[PDB]
Amino acid sequence: KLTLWTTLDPSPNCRIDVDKDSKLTLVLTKCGSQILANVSLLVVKGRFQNLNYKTNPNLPKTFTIKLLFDENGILKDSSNLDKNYWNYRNKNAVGFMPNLAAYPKSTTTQSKLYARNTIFGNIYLDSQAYNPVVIKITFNQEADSAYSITLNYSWGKDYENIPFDSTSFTFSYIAQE
Amino acid sequence: KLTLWTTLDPSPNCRIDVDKDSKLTLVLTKCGSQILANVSLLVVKGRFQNLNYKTNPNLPKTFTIKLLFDENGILKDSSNLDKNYWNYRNGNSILAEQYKNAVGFMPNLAAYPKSTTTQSKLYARNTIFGNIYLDSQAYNPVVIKITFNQEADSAYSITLNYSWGKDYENIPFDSTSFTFSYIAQE
Amino acid sequence: KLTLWTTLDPSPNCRIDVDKDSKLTLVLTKCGSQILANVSLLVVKGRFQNLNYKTNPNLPKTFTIKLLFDENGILKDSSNLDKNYWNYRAEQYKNAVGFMPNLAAYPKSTTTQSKLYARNTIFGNIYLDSQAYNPVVIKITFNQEADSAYSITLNYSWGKDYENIPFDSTSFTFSYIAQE
Ligand SMILES: CC(=O)N[C@H]1[C@H]([C@H](O)[C@H](O)CO)O[C@](O)(C(=O)O)C[C@@H]1O
Ligand SMILES: CC(=O)N[C@H]1[C@H]([C@H](O)[C@H](O)CO)O[C@](O)(C(=O)O)C[C@@H]1O
Ligand SMILES: CC(=O)N[C@H]1[C@H]([C@H](O)[C@H](O)CO)O[C@](O)(C(=O)O)C[C@@H]1O
């Protein structure tokens, strides 16, 4: 009842460009009014599996994984994460949603959120300190969802045959209730 | 699982230089012997609202927000944070009765000793460093230095020191969120 | 919300090169299926107490502290941390599998390969002597050690030619997925 997560099942569970090109491990543990979050990401196939900017000049240095939730905190099909790999550990989940007062949605006109809607972290590819990636977590940015967690990954380095196999990052956010 | 926080009320609640020039969002959630802390800061007016080191050569690149607590973990008036915006959680605002004991939320004095007469130099473990960012951009870093029990005329203290190196040009001091934990007094 | 930790007792409790050359402060607090961890490290004697790369050219810029656990989550004598300074918040405990890093989330290296998944690892920036300009990289790796059911490996490394800087680290918070 306490923890909402992606099962630890080894099989791919996430779409960046293409169905099942990635495995997201996301654990949301409710500790009162804060959610303790833990995230890692492995790309298993497609253009981001093996980064080589020396050989592929058209390769982006960013992708975005979105978790979209309805008014009851149910994950929506339009999410990048496959609905079938998201459940409580061994139903309503508003206690796990990012607080709308703390993290307001952008009025249609604006598009500009407060800064507090966002968390930045440094994560690393292939367990090496010298393969940094910036993870940008943004709450309630997506307009056609009551709640959202957006995971933006970006990097600067001209990586040469580095697998997108990320280290683990911990963060917290204020819970809706 | 009791939580001690600044209400989420949009109104300013904090003094850097001047009454109500800033809005601190601080949430302290007690998970047993550790406090899970979450902090963001917006400057709403004054010299730090909009940073421009090209146009204002006299502008510091640091300020300090202090939360000072008495022996009972009550926030003191001398704190930078307005006492009226600080209480236990009961929605998206605070409980009615202003609180009586919060020692369970205070930074442990054994883990984070106050500086003995002999030395004003604390142990390093009294301090947490984090990188936060202005205006949701990775290229506007600010160093947040959180220090416990550094202030001498208080039983307990949380000191939030903000500093940066870049000659920012028209960047609003509107910070991203940072999570940390510390060992609780009880 | 049971907590497993090193007592806050001021006495040294850890071996980097030599018995009691360091004091590790590690607090593992169980919040359901995640462990909330808090760590600081002070070196009290030996070659790493005071870093000077101008005066000592043979000094490494890394050391590793290992916590090794058996199938019941009991800390083993072969650990760098002294067994006597590790208990619930002194008659040693009996089961702590609820505090161990999950074997499904953080698999041990198959015989074939010593190469773990990246998710077994957490990187953090910590600082010596409470100064932003004395960075140290802490690399936390789970279940890397082959002769233990469970392990937490704390690798410390740095680049700067520090001149008379004490290895007195700031505090770092992380979490990991619990075995149960
Ligand atoms: C974990 C970490 O901070 N590693 C950093 C490494 C260093 O190898 C290390 O910090 C030295 O101790 O430098 C970078 O690659 C760099 O210069 O672009 C950034 C990267 O984030
Ligand atoms: C999250 C993070 O580490 N951000 C860092 C960024 C980005 O990494 C870089 O803009 C992408 O290439 O670099 C800095 O702006 C810089 O170089 O001065 C410092 C800042 O702390
Ligand atoms: C990010 C942080 O907290 N500390 C960083 C400091 C300070 O930002 C700087 O000394 C104050 O201006 O800069 C470095 O030493 C650097 O540029 O090589 C890296 C170090 O990680």
Numbering used by the authors:
A (entry chain C): 186 to 275, 285 to 371
B (entry chain B): 186 to 371
C (entry chain A): 186 to 274, 281 to 371
Sentences from the paper on this structure:
Each protein forms key interactions to promote cell infection, with the terminal domain of the fiber, the fiber knob protein, interacting with the viruses’ primary cell entry receptor. The adenovirus fiber knob protein is known to have a highly conserved trimeric structure. Our findings demonstrate a conserved binding site for sialic acid, common across the species D adenoviruses, therefore suggesting that, along with CAR, the receptor can be used to initiate cell entry.
HAdV-D15, D24 and D32 were crystallised in only their apo states, whereas HAdV-D25, D29, D30 and D53 crystals were also soaked with sialic acid. This resulted in four structures of HAdV-D25, D29, D30 and D53 in complex with sialic acid also shown in Fig. 1. The conformation of the bound sialic acid was found to be a mixture of the α and β anomers, freely exchangeable in solution and minimal protein side chain adjustment was required to accommodate either conformation. Soaking in sialic acid containing solutions reduced resolution slightly. Y314 and K349 (according to HAdV-D26 sequence) are conserved across all sequences, while the remaining residues are similar, suggesting the existence of a common sialic acid binding pocket across all species fiber knob proteins. However, the four sialic acid soaked novel crystal structures, provide a much more reliable view of the binding pocket and interactions with sialic acid.
